[PDB]
């Protein structure tokens, strides 16, 4: 399922964690991945605000 | 019923439209020839459009109304077989033949069937929201007498007896060649009558024994529809006779 807000949320949380470890390629890759699934117009305004 | 919308309404030309539309559809094609013999009457249609992959045994374009009455039909278009249209006339005529034989102990004559065709076309005319069939039928059969007869009907419902007639693709052209072939010997010898039907069919377009189907009736005995294998042998023998006279 990528046609959902919920998938965006996991990917964002993960990108924050790899960043802290200083697993920098991982955090970067995960951050683009969250934005790709965020594009869906099934996501409500708030989810978009947190994503920025 | 609820449908009473006009399909036929009378013309100042002194005709019924459908009947005339039907009559030209037998001018333009589906050669059906019949000759009357002296023991046996034979009718033949050319085209079942056997393209060498179709079945020949079960296809009927000559249908036995009775065991002493048979008809061969024609009317064509782009919708080439109007077998459906025929199939109604065939089923109602079949019961009526049998019915006439239950009531009246004489075997039903072709003259009864011909009046019955004239009334079916007409009845469809008078009834609201209804239209005449396009068929023309060559009604063959045997009377009380046991005399062979060939009668021909038109899409209006007018009938005449005729010794030999051809209809389709120039009714008059096929009949005037065939007119020479109708001689006293030809009508007497039964075998020569079978050839006369086939010999006419060949004038319009030549060859094919599968395209040609003909059914034979002898006395009051049941209809026998001939194998195509019997036809092929017969067209080959007809073609040589043409070279002999000429």
């Amino acid at each position: 399922m990528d046609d959902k807000a919920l998938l965006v949320e996991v990917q964002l949380l993960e990108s924050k964690t790899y960043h802290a470890l200083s697993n920098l390629p991982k955090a970067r890759a995960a951050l683009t991945s969250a934005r790709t699934t965020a594009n869906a117009i099934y996501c409500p305004p708030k989810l978009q605000a947190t994503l920025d | 019923m609820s449908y009473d919308r006009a399909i036929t309404v009378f013309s100042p030309d002194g005709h019924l439209f459908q009947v005339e539309y039907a009559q030209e559809a037998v001018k333009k094609g589906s050669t059906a020839v019949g000759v009357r013999g002296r023991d046996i009457v034979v009718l033949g249609v050319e085209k079942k459009s056997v393209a060498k992959l179709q079945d020949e045994r079960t296809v009927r374009k000559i249908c036995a109304l009775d065991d002493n009455v048979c008809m061969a039909f024609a009317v064509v278009a782009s919708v080439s077989g109007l077998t459906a249209d025929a199939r109604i006339v065939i089923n109602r005529a079949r019961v009526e033949c049998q019915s006439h034989r239950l009531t009246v102990g004489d075997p039903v004559t072709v003259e009864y069937i011909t009046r019955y065709i004239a009334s079916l076309k007409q009845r469809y005319t008078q009834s609201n929201g209804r239209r005449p069939f396009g068929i023309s039928a060559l009604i063959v059969g045997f009377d009380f007498d046991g005399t062979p007869r060939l009668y021909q009907t038109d899409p209006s419902g007018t009938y005449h007896a005729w010794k030999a007639n051809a209809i389709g693709r120039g009714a008059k052209s096929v009949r005037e060649f065939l007119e020479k072939n109708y001689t006293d010997d030809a009508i007497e010898t039964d075998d020569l009558t079978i050839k006369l039907v086939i010999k006419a069919l060949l004038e319009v377009v030549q060859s094919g024994g599968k395209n040609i189907e003909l059914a034979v009736m002898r006395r009051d005995q049941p209809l026998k529809i001939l194998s195509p294998e019997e036809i092929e042998k017969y067209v080959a023998e007809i073609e040589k006779e043409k070279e002999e006279n000429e």
């Binding site: 990528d2 683009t32 991945s33 934005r35 790709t36 699934t37 594009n39 869906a40 117009i41 | -």
Partner: protein, 50 residues
């Protein structure tokens, strides 16, 4: 038209990220954005352009 729409959508992303070269990341977001247009074309059973 849709296929070209991938490159075209990519450019919007490169400005946003503030790149000078259209990176791989720009393309990831673009396929998904173009897939949503396709989905709309199909829903409507008519073309998008009018």
């Amino acid at each position: 038209a849709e296929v070209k729409g991938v490159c075209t959508e990519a450019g919007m992303y490169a400005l946003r990220e503030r790149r000078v070269h259209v990176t791989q990341e720009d393309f990831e977001m673009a396929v998904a954005k173009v897939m949503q247009k396709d989905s709309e074309k199909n829903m409507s059973i008519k073309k998008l352009w009018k």
